[PDB]
Amino acid sequence: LGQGDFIRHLMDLLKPELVRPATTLYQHNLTGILETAVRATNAQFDSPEILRRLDVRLLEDTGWDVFSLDYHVDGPIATVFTRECMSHYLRVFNFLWRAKRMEYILTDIR
Amino acid sequence: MRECISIHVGQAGVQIGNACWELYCLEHGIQPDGQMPDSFNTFFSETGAGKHVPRAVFVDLEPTVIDEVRTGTYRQLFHPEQLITGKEDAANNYARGHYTIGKEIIDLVLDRIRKLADQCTGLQGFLVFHSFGGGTGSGFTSLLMERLSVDYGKKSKLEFSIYPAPQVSTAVVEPYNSILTTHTTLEHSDCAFMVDNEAIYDICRRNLDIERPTYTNLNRLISQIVSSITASLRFDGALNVDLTDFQTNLVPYPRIHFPLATYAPVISAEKAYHEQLSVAEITNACFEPANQMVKCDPRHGKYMACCLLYRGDVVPKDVNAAIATIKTKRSIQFVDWCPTGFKVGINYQPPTVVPGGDLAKVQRAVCMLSNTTAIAEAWARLDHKFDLMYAKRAFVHWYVGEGMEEGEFSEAREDMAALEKDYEEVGVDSV
Amino acid sequence: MREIVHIQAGQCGNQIGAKFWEVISDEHGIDPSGNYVGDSDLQLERISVYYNEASSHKYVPRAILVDLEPGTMDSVRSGAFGHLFRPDNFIFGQSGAGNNWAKGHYTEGAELVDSVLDVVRKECENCDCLQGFQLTHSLGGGTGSGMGTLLISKVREEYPDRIMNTFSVVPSPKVSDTVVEPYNATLSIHQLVENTDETYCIDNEALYDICFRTLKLATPTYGDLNHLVSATMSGVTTSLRFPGQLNADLRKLAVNMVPFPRLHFFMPGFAPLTARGSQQYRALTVPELTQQMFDAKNMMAACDPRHGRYLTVATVFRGRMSMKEVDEQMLAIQSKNSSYFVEWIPNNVKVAVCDIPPRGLKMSSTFIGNSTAIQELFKRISEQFTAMFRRKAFLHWYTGEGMDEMEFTEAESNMNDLVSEYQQY
């Protein structure tokens, strides 16, 4: 979440979707929303290569409990991350996602 | 001398025949062009030179699969005139394959089969490969079997049929075709070795470690079964078993003639390395309910006849000990009117591994053809699906507007009910 | 062998047919000049179902381009792949029938249908084994709806045993592109019920939703919509044409999705629909294709299948894939959505698998759905038709062309019978 500008728009577009239960959620729909955010925010001016790996994954309730980004990496660069950094980032990304919706709720009440 | 003709009908039959004839060419050393760089006589014919033409016909109402055969690696093995094909398939319709499209091809097929029979000296019988839930695999198969019974009213007619699976299914009208085929061929067949795609999928996943098998692996396993069945005709062994032996030992009553095929040493290379597959082990694997290639639990019924076809480094004493162990088991129960329910065949030729296949090279193998009352549950499921679809009268217009009558539907359903009653009657103990 | 005669009627039909022939020539490696420039032999193995070999090994599409106005003919001829069709197969008139079903079915449709019938008879007599016909048109249009209807009726009474299947663009629910759309749509559907074997109902608004939401197209033009419809047509007749593990022609699909003669209206679909941005994040697998094709958002008609029950479905897969995965995905789909499938038809899915995927893809699949949610579309058409007919709006045009109010009453009664049958089943 070090970008901030991109995650702001991404939390405004997933609001109408994640409120529904997880059973009606299918991954093929959210990708069009993520792709829309990367185009509108400042993340468009970015290396096309790294943007090819950034996608969504569905953890396996409510839509605010199974959504998370993945950024899969394979090849030579995969010897630095080694399937454990990707099992640690997602362990972190939840705590930064919760502490981000608990704030945009409290600026909506305000 | 003991020549036998194999007939492959439909896409399933033609592809299983592709696998079977690849296996036969590998076993007998025949190159895919018919030349060799006797044993190879019940299934091949010699034409002057080293050319060995297989003794089979590939008949379909669709040019696609047969054309794949005509242009494949075996393009020069089969006689071009014995690869019979139509123009429009039966479209999963029994009436099309039996009445409308099948009548324009049956004469050519019978002429070719007559040529093959004349080329033979002593004809043991026919091997019909087809699927139950297909258009030409049902209608044309039934038509061909009835015409063969009219012509060769004494030769045995063994059919290798792909029984519809309990859950997985590729067609919507499979119950209709299956019931009508069962009616028509049950009138005119000797014994039908049955197999399920779902069961072979489960076998592949559990034993061969394959998580994504295709029809190719299924066809290879079925071809191994057929090779084990015909090894006695093709090779020399301690206990030889002919087609008439199958018919006599596996069919107690004229209508109850649907045994289930099994193959014990289905194993990958590494697992085969770590195991010591012996006669007792392969026999126990054959009688394991999870290794059945028809998705019917044998514990739900009673065995009435078993045909254990061993091959390779097999000793008769070990076979006898394993069969005695099986008989002493309490989970495996037989009908009370068959105190002796084991036909045993032993062959000296170990199974041949196909280059590119998944089965590991083993020293011995066994194929078990078991006639059991557990197939009655599968029949009940099939006729239940037929009853639902016919009560709603769905898809019936497709069959009726193609040379059939609803009376045939009712008659076929009544015949299947009679077959279920016969299975129930033979199941019960004598008092 | 199994030759198909393709007829494009009206502006919508002609544009969609032009895109269809572009994608078909791409599949078979045919140059826009008609020459084969492909790589594999399977392209010419079954070229005969869609093309006719000319003198200098040039392949002429077996297509008849019929319209009541010359503008579309000129546009098709002048553009790319316009020198592909036979110049004698452009059968057009001068007056464009307006947006009047009666004009295109009774006054100008007569002369133009005699001419196009002569052309179609020549094309059929040239054929070796005719599999059937396919028509591209729009029900809400003028020459398109009425003339496609008249041609369908006449070809049907000439060739009753052949398969007649149409890819018809139905009126949209929200915004209409023609004021008299309900009249033309109702009359066309009344005629399509009895003279067609397979009607693939396509709505432009569902296509707009697909382009905006799934393909993330900022400015989707009619080219993209026509490309989607052409991909569906491709998939079906590709199952017909190329070799596969489980073949299925037009008649097999017709048998497996038409339980009753009048219930032959389908919602088409296409599985591998991805935006250019998301093509790198998505795994192309059979489960992914199945999940997308059975999604209510992907279906190409604005009819939610969750409001009805699938009588039958057909999945035409393309590419090298495992039959076990296809069958297990089909079984899982049927088990999870057991409430969305009819109970009196076990195994409501017909599976076909072809070996050759479309150009640029590794896997693909088309979804055809005979569902009882088409009743919603026919209900909307019926409400609009009765709303205009009760006060007799725009009716003097149809009456003056030579029709009668009794024909309108019969058409609406037939469409109400159709909705009654769908609701009953």
mmCIF file of N, CA and C in Angstrom, chain C residues 185-222:
data_model
loop_
_atom_site.group_PDB
_atom_site.id
_atom_site.type_symbol
_atom_site.label_atom_id
_atom_site.label_comp_id
_atom_site.label_asym_id
_atom_site.label_seq_id
_atom_site.Cartn_x
_atom_site.Cartn_y
_atom_site.Cartn_z
ATOM 1 N N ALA C 185 -40.088 -7.116 -34.365
ATOM 2 C CA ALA C 185 -39.602 -8.227 -33.557
ATOM 3 C C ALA C 185 -40.688 -9.270 -33.336
ATOM 4 N N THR C 186 -41.915 -8.834 -33.050
ATOM 5 C CA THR C 186 -43.000 -9.774 -32.801
ATOM 6 C C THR C 186 -43.330 -10.573 -34.049
ATOM 7 N N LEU C 187 -43.454 -9.898 -35.193
ATOM 8 C CA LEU C 187 -43.747 -10.622 -36.426
ATOM 9 C C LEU C 187 -42.616 -11.580 -36.786
ATOM 10 N N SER C 188 -41.369 -11.127 -36.646
ATOM 11 C CA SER C 188 -40.232 -11.976 -36.965
ATOM 12 C C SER C 188 -40.169 -13.189 -36.051
ATOM 13 N N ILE C 189 -40.440 -13.011 -34.758
ATOM 14 C CA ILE C 189 -40.400 -14.137 -33.834
ATOM 15 C C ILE C 189 -41.542 -15.103 -34.120
ATOM 16 N N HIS C 190 -42.723 -14.573 -34.442
ATOM 17 C CA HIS C 190 -43.842 -15.428 -34.812
ATOM 18 C C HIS C 190 -43.492 -16.294 -36.007
ATOM 19 N N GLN C 191 -42.724 -15.748 -36.946
ATOM 20 C CA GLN C 191 -42.316 -16.554 -38.091
ATOM 21 C C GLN C 191 -41.124 -17.454 -37.782
ATOM 22 N N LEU C 192 -40.267 -17.057 -36.842
ATOM 23 C CA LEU C 192 -39.085 -17.845 -36.507
ATOM 24 C C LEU C 192 -39.435 -19.072 -35.684
ATOM 25 N N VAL C 193 -40.515 -19.005 -34.905
ATOM 26 C CA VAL C 193 -40.885 -20.124 -34.047
ATOM 27 C C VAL C 193 -41.120 -21.396 -34.848
ATOM 28 N N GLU C 194 -41.749 -21.290 -36.018
ATOM 29 C CA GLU C 194 -42.158 -22.460 -36.776
ATOM 30 C C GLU C 194 -41.182 -22.885 -37.862
ATOM 31 N N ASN C 195 -40.295 -22.001 -38.315
ATOM 32 C CA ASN C 195 -39.470 -22.282 -39.483
ATOM 33 C C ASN C 195 -37.978 -22.316 -39.184
ATOM 34 N N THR C 196 -37.578 -22.403 -37.921
ATOM 35 C CA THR C 196 -36.170 -22.380 -37.556
ATOM 36 C C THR C 196 -35.877 -23.497 -36.564
ATOM 37 N N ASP C 197 -34.672 -24.057 -36.661
ATOM 38 C CA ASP C 197 -34.220 -25.090 -35.739
ATOM 39 C C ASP C 197 -33.419 -24.546 -34.566
ATOM 40 N N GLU C 198 -32.686 -23.453 -34.759
ATOM 41 C CA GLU C 198 -31.815 -22.912 -33.719
ATOM 42 C C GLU C 198 -31.736 -21.406 -33.909
ATOM 43 N N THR C 199 -32.301 -20.645 -32.982
ATOM 44 C CA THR C 199 -32.221 -19.190 -33.026
ATOM 45 C C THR C 199 -31.366 -18.711 -31.864
ATOM 46 N N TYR C 200 -30.210 -18.135 -32.177
ATOM 47 C CA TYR C 200 -29.289 -17.609 -31.172
ATOM 48 C C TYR C 200 -29.620 -16.136 -30.971
ATOM 49 N N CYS C 201 -30.305 -15.828 -29.873
ATOM 50 C CA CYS C 201 -30.748 -14.463 -29.613
ATOM 51 C C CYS C 201 -29.595 -13.650 -29.043
ATOM 52 N N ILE C 202 -29.243 -12.567 -29.730
ATOM 53 C CA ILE C 202 -28.149 -11.688 -29.340
ATOM 54 C C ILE C 202 -28.706 -10.287 -29.151
ATOM 55 N N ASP C 203 -28.346 -9.649 -28.043
ATOM 56 C CA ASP C 203 -28.784 -8.294 -27.746
ATOM 57 C C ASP C 203 -27.551 -7.405 -27.720
ATOM 58 N N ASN C 204 -27.671 -6.213 -28.305
ATOM 59 C CA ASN C 204 -26.530 -5.306 -28.364
ATOM 60 C C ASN C 204 -26.161 -4.759 -26.993
ATOM 61 N N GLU C 205 -27.119 -4.670 -26.071
ATOM 62 C CA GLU C 205 -26.811 -4.095 -24.767
ATOM 63 C C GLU C 205 -26.004 -5.059 -23.909
ATOM 64 N N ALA C 206 -26.292 -6.357 -24.005
ATOM 65 C CA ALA C 206 -25.433 -7.342 -23.359
ATOM 66 C C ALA C 206 -24.024 -7.290 -23.933
ATOM 67 N N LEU C 207 -23.907 -7.075 -25.243
ATOM 68 C CA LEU C 207 -22.593 -6.946 -25.859
ATOM 69 C C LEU C 207 -21.872 -5.693 -25.375
ATOM 70 N N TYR C 208 -22.601 -4.586 -25.212
ATOM 71 C CA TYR C 208 -22.000 -3.382 -24.649
ATOM 72 C C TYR C 208 -21.509 -3.633 -23.232
ATOM 73 N N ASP C 209 -22.305 -4.343 -22.432
ATOM 74 C CA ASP C 209 -21.883 -4.685 -21.079
ATOM 75 C C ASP C 209 -20.625 -5.542 -21.099
ATOM 76 N N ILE C 210 -20.562 -6.512 -22.011
ATOM 77 C CA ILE C 210 -19.385 -7.370 -22.106
ATOM 78 C C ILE C 210 -18.158 -6.548 -22.480
ATOM 79 N N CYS C 211 -18.302 -5.666 -23.471
ATOM 80 C CA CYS C 211 -17.165 -4.875 -23.925
ATOM 81 C C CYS C 211 -16.686 -3.911 -22.847
ATOM 82 N N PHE C 212 -17.613 -3.258 -22.149
ATOM 83 C CA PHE C 212 -17.221 -2.257 -21.162
ATOM 84 C C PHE C 212 -16.672 -2.905 -19.897
ATOM 85 N N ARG C 213 -17.342 -3.944 -19.402
ATOM 86 C CA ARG C 213 -17.021 -4.504 -18.098
ATOM 87 C C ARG C 213 -16.004 -5.631 -18.158
ATOM 88 N N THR C 214 -16.068 -6.487 -19.171
ATOM 89 C CA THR C 214 -15.150 -7.613 -19.294
ATOM 90 C C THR C 214 -13.935 -7.306 -20.152
ATOM 91 N N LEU C 215 -14.114 -6.653 -21.296
ATOM 92 C CA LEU C 215 -12.999 -6.315 -22.166
ATOM 93 C C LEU C 215 -12.422 -4.934 -21.888
ATOM 94 N N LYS C 216 -13.062 -4.146 -21.022
ATOM 95 C CA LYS C 216 -12.577 -2.819 -20.640
ATOM 96 C C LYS C 216 -12.317 -1.943 -21.861
ATOM 97 N N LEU C 217 -13.191 -2.051 -22.858
ATOM 98 C CA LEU C 217 -13.060 -1.257 -24.072
ATOM 99 C C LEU C 217 -13.621 0.138 -23.825
ATOM 100 N N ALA C 218 -12.778 1.157 -24.003
ATOM 101 C CA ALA C 218 -13.215 2.526 -23.754
ATOM 102 C C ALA C 218 -14.241 2.978 -24.786
ATOM 103 N N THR C 219 -13.990 2.701 -26.062
ATOM 104 C CA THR C 219 -14.883 3.087 -27.153
ATOM 105 C C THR C 219 -15.205 1.856 -27.990
ATOM 106 N N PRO C 220 -16.095 0.991 -27.505
ATOM 107 C CA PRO C 220 -16.480 -0.181 -28.299
ATOM 108 C C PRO C 220 -17.345 0.226 -29.480
ATOM 109 N N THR C 221 -16.899 -0.136 -30.675
ATOM 110 C CA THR C 221 -17.636 0.109 -31.903
ATOM 111 C C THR C 221 -18.340 -1.172 -32.327
ATOM 112 N N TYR C 222 -19.124 -1.078 -33.401
ATOM 113 C CA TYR C 222 -19.826 -2.257 -33.894
ATOM 114 C C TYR C 222 -18.865 -3.335 -34.367
#
